Amino acid sequence: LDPGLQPGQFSADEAGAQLFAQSYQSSAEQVLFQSVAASWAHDTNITAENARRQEEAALLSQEFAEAWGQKAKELYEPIWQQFTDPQLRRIIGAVRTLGSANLPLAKRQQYNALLSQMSRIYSTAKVCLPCWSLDPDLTNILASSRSYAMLLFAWEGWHNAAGIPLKPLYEDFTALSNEAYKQDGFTDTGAYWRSWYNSPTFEDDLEHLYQQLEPLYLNLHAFVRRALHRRYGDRYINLRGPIPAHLLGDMWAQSWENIYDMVVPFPDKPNLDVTSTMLQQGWQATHMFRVAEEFFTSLELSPMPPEFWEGSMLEKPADGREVVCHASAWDFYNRKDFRIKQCTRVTMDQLSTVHHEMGHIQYYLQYKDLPVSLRRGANPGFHEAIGDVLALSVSTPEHLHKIGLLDRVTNDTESDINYLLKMALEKIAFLPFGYLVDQWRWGVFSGRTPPSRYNFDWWYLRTKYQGICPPVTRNETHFDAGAKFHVPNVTPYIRYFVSFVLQFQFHEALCKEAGYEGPLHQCDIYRSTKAGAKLRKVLRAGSSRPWQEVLKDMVGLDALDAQPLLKYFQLVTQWLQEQNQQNGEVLGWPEYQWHPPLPDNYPEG
Numbered sequence: 017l018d019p020g021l022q023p024g025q026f027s028a029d030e031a032g033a034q035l036f037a038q039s040y041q042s043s044a045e046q047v048l049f050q051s052v053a054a055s056w057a058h059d060t061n062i063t064a065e066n067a068r069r070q071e072e073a074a075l076l077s078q079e080f081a082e083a084w085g086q087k088a089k090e091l092y093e094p095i096w097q098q099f100t101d102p103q104l105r106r107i108i109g110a111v112r113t114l115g116s117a118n119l120p121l122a123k124r125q126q127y128n129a130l131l132s133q134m135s136r137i138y139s140t141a142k143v144c145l146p147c148w149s150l151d152p153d154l155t156n157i158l159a160s161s162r163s164y165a166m167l168l169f170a171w172e173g174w175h176n177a178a179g180i181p182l183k184p185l186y187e188d189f190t191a192l193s194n195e196a197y198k199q200d201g202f203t204d205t206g207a208y209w210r211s212w213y214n215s216p217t218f219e220d221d222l223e224h225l226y227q228q229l230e231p232l233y234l235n236l237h238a239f240v241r242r243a244l245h246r247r248y249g250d251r252y253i254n255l256r257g258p259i260p261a262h263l264l265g266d267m268w269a270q271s272w273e274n275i276y277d278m279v280v281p282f283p284d285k286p287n288l289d290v291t292s293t294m295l296q297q298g299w300q301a302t303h304m305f306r307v308a309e310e311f312f313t314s315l316e317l318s319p320m321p322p323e324f325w326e327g328s329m330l331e332k333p334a335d336g337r338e339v340v341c342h343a344s345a346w347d348f349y350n351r352k353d354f355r356i357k358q359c360t361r362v363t364m365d366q367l368s369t370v371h372h373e374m375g376h377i378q379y380y381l382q383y384k385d386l387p388v389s390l391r392r393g394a395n396p397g398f399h400e401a402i403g404d405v406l407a408l409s410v411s412t413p414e415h416l417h418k419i420g421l422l423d424r425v426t427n428d429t430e431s432d433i434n435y436l437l438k439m440a441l442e443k444i445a446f447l448p449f450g451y452l453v454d455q456w457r458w459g460v461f462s463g464r465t466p467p468s469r470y471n472f473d474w475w476y477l478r479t480k481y482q483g484i485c486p487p488v489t490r491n492e493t494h495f496d497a498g499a500k501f502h503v504p505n506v507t508p509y510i511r512y513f514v515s516f517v518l519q520f521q522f523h524e525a526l527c528k529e530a531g532y533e534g535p536l537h538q539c540d541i542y543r544s545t546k547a548g549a550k551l552r553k554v555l556r557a558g559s560s561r562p563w564q565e566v567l568k569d570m571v572g573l574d575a576l577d578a579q580p581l582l583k584y585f586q587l588v589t590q591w592l593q594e595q596n597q598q599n600g601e602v603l604g605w606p607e608y609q610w611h612p613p614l615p616d617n618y619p620e621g
């Protein structure tokens with residue numbers, strides 16, 4: 017480490033800790049920036065040289081973190097929790113957790129190389145014919161093809177191409193991660209991840225939430241399985257068993273909005289999927305990002321700065337460069353550079369993804385003047401919910417009419433059911449997947465799931481919660497959890513389950529502050545400066561305040577609560593129950609061993 021980046025001398029009391037934090041800040045911006053810039057150079061141009069430069073930057077960040085981290089524990093470990101400044105408690109508490117910087121040099125190098133190699137395998141994998149990339153090719157197949165065998169070839173090809181080679185790498189990463197965080201006092205890596213929510217009842221609280229939500233998923237599941245049976249027939253759909261995992265519009269069966277045209281309850285009404293109108297009108301990536309920006313400024317939040325438009329990657333590069341296409345938002349920690357990297361496609365669900373990533377950017381813009389250690393969300397679920405809240409207003413048929421994407425307008429019972437069913441395919445279908453992914457990963461980090469059971473325990477949870485089955489046989493040479501971005505790219509997932517409940521709490525509170533008095537699912541907060549100011553208060557706090565207190569100020573309650581979500585969907589919850597009873601459906605999948613057969617002469621066709 018450069019000496020100029022090393023800590024000097026400070027007293028072991030609150031007065032000294034304030035000076036320690038100020039000196040840390042003045043060097044941390046330089047070290048964080050160089051690491052983000054090297055990650056950006058790699059993710060937008062994957063090459064062996066850019067991976068070497070990124071690993072070099074990661075090693076330096078670990079040297080910085082060890083030096084200031086060791087000094088913080090030596091001076092303040094027994095006293096920082098009683099300091100009178102709550103911002104200072106948070107800064108010192110973060111600095112004394114060293115993470116991967118606890119490892120000796122050789123294991124640090126091994127750790128960084130695994131992260132680089134795992135990212136490469138996932139983002140360059142391809143499916144070659146008897147080659148397709150995940151984005152756009154395989155995504156488009158899973159969303160629009162209605163040929164069972166074509167869908168199967170894409171699903172099987174992808175899970176085999178990405179999952180199989182990742183397994184040996186993921187076993188080594190898990191061991192090294194645990195060794196690192198044990199030295200910060202955590203029993204395993206999953207305990208560190210859960211500690212961010214600062215709640216001793218976290219796991220029990222989540223389970224209780226899912227108990228209230230499960231009847232809504234079971235009824236959506238049965239209704240959709242019936243529609244699939246009408247398309248594919250008894251050979252491929254078992255009305256009392258799990259759904260084959262490749263038929264629901266998405267590589268992970270994680271949201272089902274892309275099969276809306278196959279289940280719409282009242283097909284005679286206006287098409288609430290505006291994708292064909294976007295293409296007809298000539299929308300491109302730039303229009304989508306400017307339309308999202310103008311919603312934010314209608315609320316008197318900030319526009320995107322010049323550095324955002326000059327630096328971002330909003331389309332897949334056409335020079336054939338290899339890139340990480342998975343959509344992501346980037347804070348460079350210098351208060352100036354903020355960017356999105358997205359291989360944007362012109363569709364309705366991509367317009368929602370644009371809003372989701374721009375919600376992250378807006379957070380970065382609002383808290384950039386805090387110390388670096390507090391430039392985070394109140395908890396990670398807050399960060400995921402911001403863009404989704406705005407996107408709930410944008411998708412209302414009334415808002416779509418205002419921005420020219422839906423001409424015909426009606427307010428009748430059948431149109432309400434269509435809209436809420438489409439929104440249920442996006443939000444309710446996701447709940448089991450958002451809940452199960454880190455149940456799997458927490459078991460791996462704790463040792464309850466060793467390598468010999470990675471796939472056995474993944475498919476137990478997938479069938480338990482989602483009611484789906486793999487459409488070809490799997491064994492422990494397969495590593496199907498590894499075929500989902502967040503696993504090889506080491507991003508925690510329970511933030512998305514928290515977000516999908518929390519965003520309806522935010523929507524209800526902002527709709528009230530805007531003076532709206534109709535049904536919750538027809539609220540549009542567009543141009544409400546009062547809602548804007550309420551949201552701005554949350555965003556400017558960063559992680560300076562306990563999240564339970566920020567939530568109480570915003571919505572009137574200091575805990576996660578499913579009731580606003582239930583209220584939003586109530587009309588379609590009742591309708592789906594009534595329909596399934598009339599069709600004599602079985603709720604659930606009591607034939608839990610069932611798998612579909614292979615198509616005739618497969619893969620030859």
Ligand SMILES: *[C@@H]1O[C@H](CO[C@@H]2O[C@@H](C)[C@@H](O)[C@@H](O)[C@@H]2O)[C@@H](O[C@@H]2O[C@H](CO)[C@@H](O[C@@H]3O[C@H](CO)[C@@H](O)[C@H](O)[C@@H]3O)[C@H](O)[C@H]2NC(C)=O)[C@H](O)[C@H]1NC(C)=O
Nearest residue numbers: 413414426427428429430431432433532533534535536538
């Ligand atoms: C669409 O129509 C609904 C109500 O009409 C219909 O009722 C069903 C039979 C079906 O036909 C549905 O398609 C549809 O819901 C309108 O909702 C009504 O909005 C008004 C004003 O926004 C509400 O009045 C307020 O109610 C609150 C309750 O707390 C009071 O505090 C206020 O003082 C005020 O009285 C009314 O409650 C609400 N009715 C229902 C059943 O929700 C909706 O506005 C309309 N949407 C559009 C875009 O025109």
Ligand SMILES: *[C@@H]1O[C@H](CO[C@@H]2O[C@@H](C)[C@@H](O)[C@@H](O)[C@@H]2O)[C@@H](O[C@@H]2O[C@H](CO)[C@@H](O)[C@H](O)[C@H]2NC(C)=O)[C@H](O)[C@H]1NC(C)=O
Nearest residue numbers: 172176177180471486487488489490491492493494495614
């Ligand atoms: C695990 O599965 C792979 C491949 O999947 C198999 O595909 C069919 C045979 C299906 O009916 C299922 O049995 C399996 O899931 C197996 O890889 C095969 O291995 C044998 C011998 O090792 C070889 O002759 C085949 O060519 C292989 N197939 C491929 C596609 O590589 C593997 O044997 C199964 N068992 C283990 C422990 O990995």
Ligand SMILES: C[C@H](N[C@H](C(=O)O)[C@@H]1CCCN1C(=O)[C@@H](N)CC(=O)O)C(=O)N1CCC[C@H]1C(=O)O
Nearest residue numbers: 342343344345346369372373376399400502507512
């Ligand atoms: C499309 C979205 N990409 C993530 C996100 O935006 O959350 C990306 C990759 C992982 C983190 N990340 C970031 O951009 C962070 N730098 C933001 C931050 O933490 O500040 C994604 O994965 N989503 C959307 C809902 C369901 C889930 C999914 O698609 O599975």
Ligand SMILES: *[C@@H]1O[C@H](CO)[C@@H](O[C@@H]2O[C@H](CO)[C@@H](O)[C@H](O)[C@H]2NC(C)=O)[C@H](O)[C@H]1NC(C)=O
Nearest residue numbers: 057058060061062063064065066067333335337
């Ligand atoms: C992608 O990254 C590579 C580095 O791996 C860049 O290649 C370098 O480009 C500079 C500028 O022309 C040359 O001076 C170097 O000799 C190149 N190095 C190597 C190893 O080829 C490349 O420019 C990047 N591509 C884009 C589009 O940014």
Ligand SMILES: [Cl-]
Nearest residue numbers: 396508510511
């Ligand atoms: Cl999280």
Ligand SMILES: [Mg+2]
Nearest residue numbers: 266273274365
């Ligand atoms: Mg989709």
Ligand SMILES: [Zn+2]
Nearest residue numbers: 372376399400
């Ligand atoms: Zn996000």
